[PDB]
């Protein structure tokens, strides 16, 4: 009803830079607006209210701004530990509204380049009795993003593939990423070759096991 | 002052469910409204409902929630969330708050205005599937043993197919942290989560266990790694 909308979706700052994020609302709320910080596994925490408010107790590196129907919040001298979702959340009204929250924006800090070391898994002797079979493949400590392609004798693997990587280490901002291959047992004994590609930018590792010598 | 909410659980499609959060350090007064708000995995933060502190009962709702959701206080440190008709859109995980606001006007005529929340419990995990639960599998993750071996060596396990979530994996009971890379679980295609954890380890320094629990079957596994 009063609908807030966060531009963009995410945004980048190097370590030391400074990011801002925006906040609409569909009418006058007449600034009351809250910021909170999410990391993983954790609830919000509150950053600022009346848009331009320091909650007791937080680093006055954050500073929220604007009046009417656009708001700001800025990070100055961003740290990796600063990489988090940040939301806004109108307070005008709780009286027929489908969400206070804004959709959310994630901050991503630009650390030093690290490429990241590959190894491939192959499954343990017991999985493939289960008749699913997995293969695992990680990407650790590594900035700035990857893309992992399978290929399985040869032909680029496009079904059964699942990727998880960790928040930005905290320190020097870098990533772990793990990328699994998930086949019937059938599917695993029709072939030989099973392959991992993890390419940053113009460099690549590739991880490969022939099923026979495993 | 704290909050915790409990009750979350695995449940069918369709299923009713009741979560309750409890307040410690102090109790509902008309200085507050104690709400409700969900997240589901990789999802925002949604606002359900809120109820006030003071004696008179006032409940707001998300339009999506009036009809389908209850909010009360069953106590001076405990309020309550009934869901009906519970769909897989459903799961996440639920946090209470506290809810802070101006009294603004003359009256009765006074109206409350500039909420926000100052305080949130850890939040409690409710999963809508048709699946029933499922303790994981666990297998060791090693270099291919066609490999020519290698003094320095990272090795893991692989934590297959349970529901609901979450499990918790330590290495060596928690000794060994240095080196531990634990990924966010994944929902595969089959409605089971999967995840993986790996720790790289300097030589033959240890032997390295997984230590993985899974609390909603009440299972413990531990899995003894080496190349």
């Known amino acids: 009803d009063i609908v807030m909308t966060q531009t963009p979706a995410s945004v980048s700052a190097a370590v030391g830079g400074t990011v801002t994020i925006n906040c609409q609302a569909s009418?006058?709320?007449?600034?009351?607006l809250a910021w909170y910080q999410q990391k993983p596994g954790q609830p919000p925490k509150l950053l600022i209210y009346?848009?331009?408010t320091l909650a007791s107790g937080v680093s006055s590196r954050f500073k929220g701004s604007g009046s009417g129907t656009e708001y700001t919040l800025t990070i100055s001298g961003v740290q990796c530990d600063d990489a988090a979702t940040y939301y806004c959340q109108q307070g005008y009204s709780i009286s027929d509204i489908d969400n206070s929250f804004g959709g959310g924006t994630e901050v991503v800090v630009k650390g030093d380049p690290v490429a990241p070391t590959v190894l491939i898994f192959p499954p343990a002797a017991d999985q493939v009795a289960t008749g699913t079979v997995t293969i695992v493949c990680v990407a650790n400590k590594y900035f700035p993003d990857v893309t992992v392609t399978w290929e399985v004798d040869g032909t680029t693997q496009t079904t059964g593939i699942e990727n998880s990587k960790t928040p930005q280490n905290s320190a020097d901002c870098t990533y772990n990423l793990s990328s699994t291959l998930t086949l019937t047992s059938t599917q695993y004994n029709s072939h030989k070759e099973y392959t991992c590609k993890v390419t940053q930018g113009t460099t690549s590792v590739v991880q490969s096991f022939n099923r026979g010598d495993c | 002052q704290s909050l915790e909410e409990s009750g979350g659980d695995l449940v069918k499609p369709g299923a009713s469910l009741t979560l309750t959060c409890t307040a410690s350090?102090?109790?509902?007064?008309?200085?507050?409204?104690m709400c409700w708000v969900r997240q589901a995995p990789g999802k925002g933060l949604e606002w359900i409902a809120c109820?006030?502190?003071?004696?008179?009962?006032?409940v707001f709702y998300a339009t999506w929630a009036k009809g389908r959701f209850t909010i009360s206080k069953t106590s001076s440190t405990t309020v309550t969330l009934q869901m009906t008709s519970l769909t897989a859109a459903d799961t996440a995980t639920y946090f209470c708050?506290?809810?802070?606001?101006?009294?603004?006007?003359?009256?009765?005529?006074?109206?409350?205005?500039?909420?926000?929340?100052?305080?949130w419990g850890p939040g409690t995990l409710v999963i809508v599937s048709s699946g029933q639960p499922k303790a994981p599998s666990v297998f060791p993750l090693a270099p291919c043993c066609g490999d020519t071996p290698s003094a320095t060596v990272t090795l893991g396990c692989l934590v297959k197919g349970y529901l609901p979530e979450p499990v918790t994996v330590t290495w060596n009971s928690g000794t060994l942290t240095n080196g531990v890379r634990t990924f966010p679980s994944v929902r595969q295609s089959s409605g089971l989560y999967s995840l993986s954890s790996v720790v790289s380890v300097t030589s033959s320094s240890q032997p390295v266990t997984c230590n993985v629990a899974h609390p909603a079957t009440n299972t413990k596994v531990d899995k003894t790694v080496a190349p």
């Open positions: 350090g102090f109790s509902f007064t008309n200085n507050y409204y």
């Open positions: 708050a506290r809810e802070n606001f101006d009294a603004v006007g003359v009256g009765g005529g006074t109206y409350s205005t500039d909420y926000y929340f100052d305080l």
């Open positions: 009346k848009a331009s």
């Open positions: 109820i006030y502190g003071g004696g008179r009962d006032i």
């Open positions: 009418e006058t709320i007449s600034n009351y």
